[model samples]
Target chain A: PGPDIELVYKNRGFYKHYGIRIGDQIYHLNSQDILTTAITGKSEFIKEQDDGNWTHAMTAPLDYFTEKYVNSMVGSKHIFSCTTNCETIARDIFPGQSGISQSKALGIVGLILLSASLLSLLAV
Target chain B: PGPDIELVYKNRGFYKHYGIRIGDQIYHLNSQDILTTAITGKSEFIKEQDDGNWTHAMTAPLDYFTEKYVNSMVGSKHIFSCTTNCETIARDIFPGQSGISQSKALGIVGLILLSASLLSLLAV
Candidate 1:
């Protein structure tokens, strides 16, 4: 499948257990409550609000669904951010959602640096 | 390691679920009661009696063990006879055991003919 891409779906405190389908497009569904669609070759993220509103975020390749290291669906924001490139896009959608700012995709980069420093410190 | 030969072990009325090991030699074991050994390049059949007796019937190649079609151990005389060349050797082991005379390996041949006839009739 070309290359692996990663996409994240956050219910934004609204829904539960989403099923996503990826092909030439992305289809995100949650029971009868919300169904959202996105085009491929571009990336998008979306969230459904408590007021019955759908917030469009970003999108990525269909390869996102098949990445070995990414979880297909995650239940909470913190865990999802921890496991994915979702942190930067996550920060963009909901300000300070990952406790990292949107500048230079700094929060995700900082996390990577912090992880490397911890590895080096542990090695020492 | 060579071409497959067939061997059958029958308990006659003694044990349940026999364990068989085949190597350069054949070992037929039933609990600690009966243990028998036979050499290579020959065929053997055996039946254990109720009186704690081990009777050596015949020996064959170790190919006997690895043959896919033959059952390793059988519990009943009739079923074993029906499925194997055991009918002839079986007659030699116990006169009239398979109801075929020991003048030649005629009993096994007769059963094979009977089976082939039944198949031909069904095909007709």
Candidate 2:
């Protein structure tokens, strides 16, 4: 399996916001709808409520759900660095993209590690 | 009952982000967790996943859920104006606060109208 990573950040705004950017697409961590849409490449699980709020049934693995949600919450601005292996993985995943440049590759890797670490801590 | 409003916005960025600010609290529309916490004055619905993503079983009304999620996604930058009644409602709800000032009062009203209109259109 490939590296599954996620990160969370606290901004100066006094709100705990979260998200992950994949190339040009950014997924907000507050809901599973967007992330589920992105990873599954399908929108079948997402439903619209009578009042207009969206609800999504879980159809993906817990790992993907957790990683994506964690990464989605932590924006690019909050990210600082990543592991070398993670950067290489990012480069391999998104090649020839200006947005996922070398610098962002590091950030992606960093988030992955942070997420992995968080998962481990929770396991204890 | 007060106006139940929610609005959606598409930005230059290829991502669709969502959130709403209430006094000092900002709730992201992507998940029901934050909004649920804000409205119910309770946190029982929010649960931590084995993988680290937070899952929230909604406890608030459908109207509040839809309105907060819609408003959360539009952000402060995209909103322009609102109806006088909506502004009056906003002022009455969050009085004596700098963030919910006169300008934002109008924006809140605008979003409430937008959301109500959306609900009407969806009914057709």
Candidate 3:
């Protein structure tokens, strides 16, 4: 009914790491919050409620595991960020793979749009 | 068979955070490693095997806890440091309390020794 809640990091002393702060207030970023964040990245967050079409990020990344990263792909580069409270993570380890692959997808999408424009001009 | 293994943090890239690196090799700092580390501090790391005398740092600190630290004492001033691999901690949150309070104990011991000598002189 309402917009999904996102906790903006705030500068509170007590809630500094325990909860995410947005201005004057703190928000608890639970498993649901992490699930939502994971989806927007690339592969949707697959909960048990969903069909076999969806899978946990851990299992999904295992299928697409890469020892060496794709140099040109933005997603291939690893970026490390810390939550004030790591307990907030749905899985013990966060979605390192999905975030990396999603960056690659962005590059692919940009290329697709460019190719589409070229095909349209040739047809005209 | 050998001594209890303690993973010394090293500069290895692969085992950088997942495992503690000791020189050329990586060692797993399991719950056992942390339990030992905790006991050496103040409150003994209570495994399921132990009695009511032992307690987890979390519960023990809660009972002896203070909102505002004893500012003049060594324990009250919170000294923040980070481990490359936080998961190495037995608990999700490490012993913020024992580390703080142990420093306080140092002050108490110093005072006790001083008082003991003063009492000996009065008896003589």
Candidate 1: where are CA atoms >4 Å away?
A1-26, A30-53, A69-124, B1-124
TM-score of 2: 0.23
Instruction: Give all candidates' CA lDDT scores.
Output: 0.25, 0.31, 0.23
- The CA root-mean-square deviation of candidate 1, after full C-alpha superposition on the true structure, stands at 27.6
lDDT of 3 by residue, B1-124 (tens): 1222222221222112112222233322222222122223321111121122211112222112211112111121112222344322222222333344432433232222121111111110
lDDT accuracy of residue A69 in candidate 1:
14
DockQ of 2: 0.02
Model 3's chain A TM-score stands at 0.21
Better candidate by DockQ, 2 or 3? 2
The best candidate in terms of TM-score = 2
Candidate 2 lDDT over A1-124, as tens digits, reads 3332222232312223233333332333222332222223221111111232222212322244334323322332233433333344344434444355755554444343233222221111
Sort the candidates on TM-score, descending order: 2, 3, 1
Clashing pairs in 3: none
Model 2: how far residue A92 lies from native, Å: 2.4
Pick by TM-score: 1 or 3, better one = 3
Clashes of each: 18, 17, 0
